[PDB]
Chains A and B, each alone.
Chain A
Amino acid sequence: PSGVEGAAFQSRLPHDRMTSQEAACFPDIISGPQQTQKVFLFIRNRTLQLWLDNPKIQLTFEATLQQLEAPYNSDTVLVHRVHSYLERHGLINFGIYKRIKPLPTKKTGKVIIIGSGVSGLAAARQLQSFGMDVTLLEARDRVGGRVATFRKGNYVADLGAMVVTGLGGNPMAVVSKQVNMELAKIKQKCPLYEANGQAVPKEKDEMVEQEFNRLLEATSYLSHQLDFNVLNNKPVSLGQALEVVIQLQEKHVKDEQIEHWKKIVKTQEELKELLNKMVNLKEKIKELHQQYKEASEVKPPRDITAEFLVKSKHRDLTALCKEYDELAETQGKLEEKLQELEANPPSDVYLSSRDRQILDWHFANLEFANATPLSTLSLKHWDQDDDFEFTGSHLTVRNGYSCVPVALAEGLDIKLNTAVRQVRYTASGCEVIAVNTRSTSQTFIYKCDAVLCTLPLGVLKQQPPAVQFVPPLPEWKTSAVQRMGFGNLNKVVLCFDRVFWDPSVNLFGHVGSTTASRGELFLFWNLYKAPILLALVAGEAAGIMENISDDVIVGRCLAILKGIFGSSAVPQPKETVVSRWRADPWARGSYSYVAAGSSGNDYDLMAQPITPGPSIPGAPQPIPRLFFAGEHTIRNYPATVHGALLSGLREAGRIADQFLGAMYTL
């Protein structure tokens, strides 16, 4: 997709149609003649094109109007409306760019942002741009949140976000042209090595992967066609569905074995009946011959009855011998029909032990992608966001992802080592209570017009709470929080002084011995300038490994590698880092997932701002005061950096609309 249509696609918009959001701001246009809608769409797509063509500088209304040609550049109000609309919603002029129009010297409104991860940072830049007073309170001694990079000497390794999943329609594409980012393609070749250390032949690998895909396809059929979505009042999980599908395939293998052996008995039985006939017929023949022989003893000349006897017995004997030859013909047919079936047995098993282990590697891989065991994913909605995937190859940030948040932090007022303890929101404003993480007694009070909460879902779930809301959040919100899933996945960074692995291979797998341990160090990444190997801990293993010391974890890693590349080839690591996202009090997990019993609607609920009740009985309905951003608040792109990046842009626009007013909606 290129030209103005490419711009829409790159902004996640339909090029030939107005969105629901656009309808809300341009009700006059969407309800009017088709021609006007087409004019609007062109202005919108073109404005997006100008921004995308050069995201390093602020795209102003004046600049836009000048670059438009007749007759589009004639309706100046419509152009200005579209421009302000895009700007306000963060579709243009987001991230880090050179500002043309200086920031208003005197600011309007005060906003406190809890958390300085990508969602918080993106919202802050926007709000600052719109002219608001913004302060971010961050518990950690750094910015970035779940975007955390290990840096020591020349060693660089991401402990959090690491992959950019295609630049097509990805807002990170714009960020990568602004933020210094060294993107490198991830080669998809990934050999797997069984526990014994020997590689998996191409044939197996492909067959098992095809089956893995077939099984996923099968659970989808089980969900949409057999409506197997509730079992014993409980929502069915992906794991359960897969177990059922596999059991059914095992059943089919046995059903076929049975029908095969039943064809053998049926034939084997027909043979018995034929043989019985033959044995009885041979007796009759044996007897007739004896009679014929006796009749032939009456030598001629003999009367006609004696002659008749000889001739008669002869005929009866020949007739019976003909019957025997016919049955012998049938015997040869049945006998061979048996050597045929005996030689063509159906399959012995659905999946051998080896096949199951390799299959478990694929499941571990899926457990890694969703940062959760398959038994916790909603069968109905686990892949609710698949239709929104970006295009292009997956990439990694060669210089460490942290370069993004660090850059987004430029010029912002950030209070590090400040842990928010309480959020108070009332009809006339909010007050956030925070402590200094280095000496908890030291307390801070921040008064503001609005609060943007970007605390991770893991933190929001903490019981008893880590952050208290006063008044408490309503049940519609807390229930969404309880329902949503909050996963976990960990990484083990191994820094070596030499390269003992295949340098042309970006990643390789380790196939576990049992299903229980499938996610334990199942995948290794070779990705940076330095000789570094990154090991992944997924699924059920993630949670358990957190209770294991670094040395024992690293020991296991080395053991695996020695098994693959040879004992003498693998040296002791010079530096090792092990992440523990679940234990991290500022994260309490890695990222959200659609839990069984949940749905994409919960992400919408997480996103709805809270409006306090009036302070005075009978006083009019207040303004919303408490807002939410963060990956767990964006239905189409949850659990990602771009998702967090977008959620911040969204809330900044909503806050600004609420407190600064909208001049583009009229």
Chain B
Amino acid sequence: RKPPKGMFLSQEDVEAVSANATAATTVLRQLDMELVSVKRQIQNIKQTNSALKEKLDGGIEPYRLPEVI
């Protein structure tokens, strides 16, 4: 009834990998590319966040007022 635990095999995926002689290679490369595409997207945001953090340097300390108790 089921694949071994941890093994993945769907009807949908088998069809994709066996559609033609080089269908598998195509599937795996298109995934290698999606991966690079996401990694560069990460470095990009990391770089942007790093700049935004540099603007908050010092926080809001010099702008705080004592409490009127």
B29 to chain A, nearest CB (A): 10
Q: How far is the CA of A33 from the CA of B35 in the complex (A)?
A: 73
Q: A248 contacts B49, CB within 8 Å?
A: no
Q: Known contacts A217-B4, A244-B18; decide if A276 and B34 are in contact (CB<8 Å).
A: no
**A257: chain B residues within 8 A (beta carbon):** 35
Residue from the set B14, B24, B63 with the largest chain A CB neighbour count within 10 Å: B63
Surface stretch bound by B, among A10-18, A266-274, A513-521: A266-274
Q: B28 contacts A272, CB within 8 Å?
A: no
**A248: chain B residues within 8 A (beta carbon):** 8-9, 13-14, 17
Closest 6 CB pairs of A and B: A275-B52, A254-B31, A252-B8, A289-B63, A247-B24, A268-B45
Q: How far is the CA of A70 from the CA of B34 in the complex (A)?
A: 82
Q: A254 contacts B35, CB within 8 Å?
A: yes
- Asked if A470 CB lies within 8 Å of chain B CBs, one says no
Partner of B45, one of A217, A228, A265: A265
- Asked if A318 CB lies within 8 Å of chain B CBs, one says yes
Instruction: Output the nearest chain A residue to B21 by Cβ-Cβ distance.
Output: A232
**B39: chain A residues within 8 A (beta carbon):** 261
**B52: chain A residues within 8 A (beta carbon):** 272, 275-276, 278-279
What are 17 A-B pairs with beta-carbon distances under 8 A? A214-B4, A214-B6, A217-B3, A222-B9, A244-B14, A247-B27, A248-B14, A249-B8, A250-B28, A251-B28, A252-B8, A265-B41, A271-B45, A275-B53, A276-B52, A286-B63, A321-B60
Q: B49 contacts A285, CB within 8 Å?
A: no
Q: How far is the CA of A321 from the CA of B65 in the complex (A)?
A: 9
Q: Known contacts A289-B63, A314-B68; decide if A218 and B31 are in contact (CB<8 Å).
A: no
B41 to chain A, nearest CB (A): 6
Q: How far is the CA of A324 from the CA of B32 in the complex (A)?
A: 41
**A264: chain B residues within 8 A (beta carbon):** 42
- Asked if B69 CB lies within 8 Å of chain A CBs, one says no
Given contacts A251-B17, A262-B38, A282-B55, 7 further A-B contacts (CB under 8 A): A221-B3, A228-B14, A251-B27, A271-B45, A282-B60, A289-B63, A314-B68
Residues of B within 8 A of A (CB): 1-4, 6-9, 11, 13-14, 17-18, 24, 27-28, 31-32, 34-35, 38-39, 41-42, 45-46, 48-49, 52-53, 55-56, 59-60, 62-65, 68
Residues of A within 8 A of B (CB): 214, 217-218, 221-222, 225-226, 228, 231, 244-245, 247-252, 254-255, 257-258, 261-262, 264-265, 268-269, 271-272, 275-276, 278-279, 282, 285-286, 288-289, 292, 314, 317-318, 321, 324, 328
Q: How far is the CA of A444 from the CA of B17 in the complex (A)?
A: 59
Q: A271 contacts B49, CB within 8 Å?
A: yes
Interface class of chain A by DSSP: helix
Q: A268 contacts B28, CB within 8 Å?
A: no
Q: Known contacts A261-B39, A314-B65, A318-B65; decide if A268 and B60 are in contact (CB<8 Å).
A: no
Q: B63 contacts A247, CB within 8 Å?
A: no
Instruction: Output the nearest chain B residue to A290 by Cβ-Cβ distance.
Output: B63
**A250: chain B residues within 8 A (beta carbon):** 28
Q: B9 contacts A247, CB within 8 Å?
A: no
Q: A225 contacts B1, CB within 8 Å?
A: yes
Q: A272 contacts B45, CB within 8 Å?
A: yes
Q: B60 contacts A285, CB within 8 Å?
A: yes
Instruction: Output the nearest chain B residue to A250 by Cβ-Cβ distance.
Output: B28
Q: How far is the CA of A271 from the CA of B52 in the complex (A)?
A: 10
A296 to chain B, nearest CB (A): 10
A219 to chain B, nearest CB (A): 10
Partner of A279, one of B3, B41, B55: B55
Q: B11 contacts A226, CB within 8 Å?
A: yes
B44 to chain A, nearest CB (A): 9
B53 to chain A, nearest CB (A): 7
Instruction: Output the nearest chain A residue to B67 by Cβ-Cβ distance.
Output: A318
**B49: chain A residues within 8 A (beta carbon):** 268, 271-272, 275
**B8: chain A residues within 8 A (beta carbon):** 248-249, 251-252
